[PDB]
Amino acid sequence: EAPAAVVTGAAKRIGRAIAVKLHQTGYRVVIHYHNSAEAAVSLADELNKERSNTAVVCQADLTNSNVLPASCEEIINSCFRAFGRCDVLVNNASAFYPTPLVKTVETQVAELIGTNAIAPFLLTMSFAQRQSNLSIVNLCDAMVDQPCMAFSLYNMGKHALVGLTQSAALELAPYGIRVNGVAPGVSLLPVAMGEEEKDKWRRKVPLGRREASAEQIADAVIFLVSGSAQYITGSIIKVDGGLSLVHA
Amino acid sequence: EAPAAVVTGAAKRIGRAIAVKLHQTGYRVVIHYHNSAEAAVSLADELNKERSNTAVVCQADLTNSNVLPASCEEIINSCFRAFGRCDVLVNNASAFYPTPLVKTVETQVAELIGTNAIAPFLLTMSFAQRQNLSIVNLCDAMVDQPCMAFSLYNMGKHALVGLTQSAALELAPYGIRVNGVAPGVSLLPVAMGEEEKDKWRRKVPLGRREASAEQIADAVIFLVSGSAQYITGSIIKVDGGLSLVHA
Amino acid sequence: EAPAAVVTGAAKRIGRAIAVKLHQTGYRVVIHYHNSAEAAVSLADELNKERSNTAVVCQADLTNSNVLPASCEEIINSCFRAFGRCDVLVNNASAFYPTPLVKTVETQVAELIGTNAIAPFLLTMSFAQRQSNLSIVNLCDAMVDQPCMAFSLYNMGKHALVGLTQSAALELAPYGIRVNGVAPGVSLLPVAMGEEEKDKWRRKVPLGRREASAEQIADAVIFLVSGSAQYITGSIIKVDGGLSLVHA
Amino acid sequence: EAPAAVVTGAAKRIGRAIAVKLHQTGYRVVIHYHNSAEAAVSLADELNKERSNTAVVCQADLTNSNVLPASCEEIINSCFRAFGRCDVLVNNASAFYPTPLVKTVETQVAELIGTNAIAPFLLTMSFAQRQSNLSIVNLCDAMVDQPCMAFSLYNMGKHALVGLTQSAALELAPYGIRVNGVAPGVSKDKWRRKVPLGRREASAEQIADAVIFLVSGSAQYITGSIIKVDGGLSLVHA
Ligand SMILES: NC(=O)c1ccc[n+]([C@@H]2O[C@H](COP(=O)([O-])OP(=O)(O)OC[C@H]3O[C@@H](n4cnc5c(N)ncnc54)[C@H](OP(=O)(O)O)[C@@H]3O)[C@@H](O)[C@H]2O)c1
Ligand SMILES: NC(=O)c1ccc[n+]([C@@H]2O[C@H](COP(=O)([O-])OP(=O)(O)OC[C@H]3O[C@@H](n4cnc5c(N)ncnc54)[C@H](OP(=O)(O)O)[C@@H]3O)[C@@H](O)[C@H]2O)c1
Ligand SMILES: NC(=O)c1ccc[n+]([C@@H]2O[C@H](COP(=O)([O-])OP(=O)(O)OC[C@H]3O[C@@H](n4cnc5c(N)ncnc54)[C@H](OP(=O)(O)O)[C@@H]3O)[C@@H](O)[C@H]2O)c1
Ligand SMILES: NC(=O)c1ccc[n+]([C@@H]2O[C@H](COP(=O)([O-])OP(=O)(O)OC[C@H]3O[C@@H](n4cnc5c(N)ncnc54)[C@H](OP(=O)(O)O)[C@@H]3O)[C@@H](O)[C@H]2O)c1
Ligand SMILES: O=C1C[C@H](c2cccc(O)c2)Oc2ccc(O)cc21
Ligand SMILES: O=C1C[C@H](c2cccc(O)c2)Oc2ccc(O)cc21
Ligand SMILES: O=C1C[C@H](c2cccc(O)c2)Oc2ccc(O)cc21
Ligand SMILES: O=C1C[C@H](c2cccc(O)c2)Oc2ccc(O)cc21
């Protein structure tokens, strides 16, 4: 009788915080991961010790290819195989790196458009076809319109994800599936980023001059899936401490 | 120890539901009203019966005039006089009626621009000057696809978007968050014939029904909560996908 | 036979460059002004030297008041008085100054909301009522969603002006009146501003690291009034060298 | 001397009107085509009869694949081969069809995202890499935020194209390359009746007019902007 959720890229960072929070709210969770096998199984162990048989892992490369549909179909099936249901999909996995206009370009396209947009489209297709408070939450980007220089493919992927969010909200509304987004500004900074670079970004945030915690992101996801957002579809909630309001 | 909130136009409909849910959440409330005295008083009595001394009413006309700043200062002051603190301001009161391009026009300007934008700005000023603090402005999900011949109403709601953004930016250093909730079709006019209500209800993708006032209130409750501590300058549509629907 | 245009705040700076370019294009012009009497008359003299009887001035305060509707009515009337028609309204006049949240406030409201929004609405009403290629161009602000801090009332007026542009495009389209906007980022900087602060802003602009000329702004106005924009209504053209794309 | 432009999907409809108008303004043009060879050539004949050796054709499939980057590089190369320069890129080519959520799906991806967004990105890269009034114009969609039901992949591609427009305007501004969009609405009678401005479709020429403005010296300060050419349609509530 407990609902079940899929969170993609859930081994670590924001995805983990979302799977933890959904699990604390009473969901059964599929922890999807790609390379972070040890971190995924560790998380699943932690959740299962809290309530047995409530977390499973599922490995998949979400790069675009001719087998991406089957991989997306398999992630959703994993939720139905473990739990008998799939109530919520959180499209959280993301590739993020520069692609200057001035890895083959075709691999960059597949990872950056694949993970950020095509895999959410296919997961959304599979989640809908395999079908109560059903919804999807896409992890978007509050700075989509003021993009980092030399990030065109990543920015294109996140814009396409805004498109998907709106299109799928429209199309799936008659089936009672809501589709919303959460758009972080700066949250957990890159592990490879030096402290001095971190602090440059921190200093730009009006609300408290610091990045969002992973939990702060997850809070907005939890709202969107809850009974308190039952009329909300096609909405993208920024969780950016005002960063997107700040001019150059 | 309990926080306090001001809700403008709180006697009826959406404002009432906001006031109720804030009260249920543990807030003391100033129920602002303009003409609906008997409804505002009945709400305050209902709330005070639940928890003594947790609701007061405050009457004020929020039409723009040279007395508006003093009116808006008095509303915020009443919250401090009643409760010793003011944690939350909800700018909900609104005039809404058509102003075709083809009451004097200056009265229309004072009502539609004053209630929807100037009074929120003056209230926001008074709230900040007197300081989990936050302001929620009731915006309009259809602001970019507006009702025909509603130009002043639409200008006031666009201005409120600007206020939401400008005040989030300027008040973030004081730890005051500023957000909006943007209904699509929520509670319909009482007099509107069912056949007309149904024309609008049928356009809504999610459930072919309008939002209840409580569903609008739920987004306000989220925004003022510890769960939105990092959210400022955001406007959450609560519209069942209505604004995504093309002509 | 020559069309006629009203330009508000046309004595100086951007509105003057609009008036000039409209006149160069074949229009007869009403040069509206408030305080810049010598500048206004001097402009009308220059245009009239070039084609006699093609320019008049019209004085008015565009601050909100109970007589504002009459003043806006009189501006439109002046165009019909001088030229027998009124084909184009350019809403260019603007008050701009800070109003920190933390002159009386009701004067600030009257000025910043009156000039930027109410006078445009009233001028639009008067234009439409007194009524080919008819159109209205509103001067907006490309930075409306990334506001200068402490400019709430200004930013509110300009957001209202976007609402007006869309509402009036919708309502006046059946009358053949197109309604569009032109949104400068940094163009001619304040007389009062120090050269160091001017260079700070110029440095932020991606395209050329400089402010827009007034003529670059006028060029977009000229497009939107022309026969090459006959299917364009409700659009706002940013003329800001990419400034609004730049993150904090 | 005379500037040169590449227009993708230039054989018919909006891209043809665009090539014609740029040619009338004094550009030399590369008329790109996929399937419409006879049309591309007929247009080329009409422009060269007007002014000899000012119009060439270029065949390429703009579907995403392992060979798309070569194809896009070759389109830009064709401009430089024929004309010695490439001043203007118009990304007009587009695939358009529904992809319900409830051709393999990955061929749909390749066409809807490849032609509408990835080709524009690779063409932008090639245009920029090969470089006094340089600009790119992307043909966007005025209804991007109020999409047709069951057109998710198309809509995703057009959103990605908005992102490309903004990212490339930012990144290429230092090179003096401006990057802007034109967003048509409708350019059958059911639709035309909804249009506030005279309840008719945009002609292709009205779309071309906005392109012509954006590439002109009257737009030398405009970058990152998307001009709706939709008769007000995007303003109309449901
Ligand atoms: N962090 C921020 O400040 C910020 C800012 C804006 C937007 N966002 C968005 O917020 C969400 C969460 O952010 P985040 O920093 O937590 O994400 P992240 O750490 O950058 O990535 C999350 C996970 O994505 C998975 N992933 C990457 N490439 C993949 C592929 N090819 N196939 C399958 N999975 C793949 C990875 O899983 P494995 O580790 O298992 O390989 C990674 O752990 C993302 O959608 C991101 O775009 C974040
Ligand atoms: N209902 C919808 O579908 C919908 C759609 C979009 C946006 N909204 C927005 O959501 C909010 C709540 O909507 P609603 O339908 O519940 O509001 P409403 O019933 O139209 O108005 C709310 C209250 O505003 C107060 N008010 C009106 N004119 C005033 C004035 N001159 N001075 C002081 N107070 C005044 C009135 O108080 P008294 O009764 O005490 O005189 C009224 O009861 C409003 O901001 C509205 O614009 C609603
Ligand atoms: N310059 C920029 O970078 C920039 C940036 C964003 C937006 N804009 C917008 O673009 C337009 C033109 O810019 P600008 O810098 O040329 O404007 P401006 O010089 O700041 O103002 C233009 C004129 O507005 C008139 N005006 C001001 N208060 C008035 C009142 N109460 N009644 C009647 N007229 C009044 C003044 O006329 P008198 O001189 O006759 O008193 C002034 O010369 C404006 O709408 C502005 O908001 C400009
Ligand atoms: N018409 C409208 O109302 C409207 C509305 C919104 C947006 N738009 C946008 O405006 C632009 C032009 O509109 P339109 O209606 O003229 O376009 P269209 O006729 O739908 O298509 C334009 C051209 O794109 C080319 N194309 C299609 N698939 C291709 C592929 N896989 N590889 C290479 N080329 C391919 C075709 O060239 P070949 O013929 O050579 O095969 C076609 O003639 C497009 O970007 C469109 O998305 C148009
Ligand atoms: O780790 C980051 C921070 C990074 C970031 C860094 C600095 C400023 C800013 O607005 C955003 O944004 C990301 C986007 C996608 C993603 O998967 C990870 C990140
Ligand atoms: O009663 C309404 C419904 C009305 C409405 C009616 C029909 C469709 C729609 O999008 C909105 O919107 C309002 C806006 C402000 C307000 O104070 C009240 C209302
Ligand atoms: O003089 C300016 C520049 C000024 C400005 C100054 C610095 C940055 C920026 O984006 C804009 O904006 C204005 C807005 C209205 C107006 O009437 C005049 C100005
Ligand atoms: O022919 C159309 C019309 C079609 C259309 C049809 C009806 C309503 C509407 O907003 C758009 O939009 C297109 C988008 C891409 C494209 O290549 C062609 C078209």
PDB file of C-alpha atoms in Angstrom, chain D residues 18 39 44 71 117 119 167 181-182 229 234:
ATOM      1  CA  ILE D  18      13.768  33.858 -47.068  1.00  0.00           C
ATOM      2  CA  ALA D  39      12.597  22.861 -56.396  1.00  0.00           C
ATOM      3  CA  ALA D  44      18.665  28.597 -58.137  1.00  0.00           C
ATOM      4  CA  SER D  71      27.214  17.359 -43.504  1.00  0.00           C
ATOM      5  CA  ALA D 117      18.210  21.641 -32.801  1.00  0.00           C
ATOM      6  CA  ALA D 119      21.919  20.570 -37.019  1.00  0.00           C
ATOM      7  CA  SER D 167      23.773  30.403 -25.653  1.00  0.00           C
ATOM      8  CA  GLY D 181      15.302  34.066 -33.893  1.00  0.00           C
ATOM      9  CA  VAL D 182      12.058  34.576 -35.777  1.00  0.00           C
ATOM     10  CA  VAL D 229       5.694  37.011 -36.195  1.00  0.00           C
ATOM     11  CA  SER D 234       0.426  33.414 -28.806  1.00  0.00           C
TER      12      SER D 234
END
